[PDB]
Design a protein around this ligand. Structure first.
Ligand SMILES: [Au+]
Ligand SMILES: [Au+]
Ligand SMILES: [Au+]
Ligand SMILES: [Cl-]
Ligand code: NA
Length: 129
């Protein structure tokens, strides 16, 4: 599923991400934009041979099991394919563990490089939330 910006904002808010570990909704929408262009089916290969899955590009190295990432963990205890669903519940619940792990949203290199220190409120401008 390719979400609209405000559609994703509303889904992430309903799923409890607004100010989760202190990160305003705009941060999460900004992250999803630059990670996946709001596309739940987005997959990308990492240099280490791990893969990033779904709207928040969650990595098989640590968080999910894709059956082909040697010497990896499955800390969200999910198949990586669950992160590709039109339903963002698994992505959001896994993202909550990730951002809690000590590095906050710096775990998403695209958040650090493209969202951090920017006016992220712009990502939820005009949305009914
Ligand atoms: Au909180
Ligand atoms: Au992208
Ligand atoms: Au900011
Ligand atoms: Cl689970
Ligand atoms: Na990416």
């Amino acid at each position: 599923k390719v979400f609209g910006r405000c559609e994703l904002a509303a889904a992430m808010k309903r799923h409890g991400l607004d100010n989760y570990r202190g990160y305003s909704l705009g941060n999460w929408v900004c992250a999803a934009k630059f990670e996946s262009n709001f596309n739940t089916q987005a997959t990308n290969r990492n240099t280490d041979g791990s893969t990033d899955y779904g709207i928040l590009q969650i990595n098989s190295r640590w968080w999910c099991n894709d059956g082909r990432t040697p010497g990896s963990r499955n800390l969200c205890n999910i198949p990586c394919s669950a992160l590709l669903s039109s339903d963002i519940t698994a992505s959001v619940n896994c993202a909550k563990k990730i951002v809690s792990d000590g590095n906050g949203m710096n775990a998403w290199v695209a958040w650090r490089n493209r969202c951090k220190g920017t006016d992220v409120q712009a990502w939820i401008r005009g949305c009914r939330l």
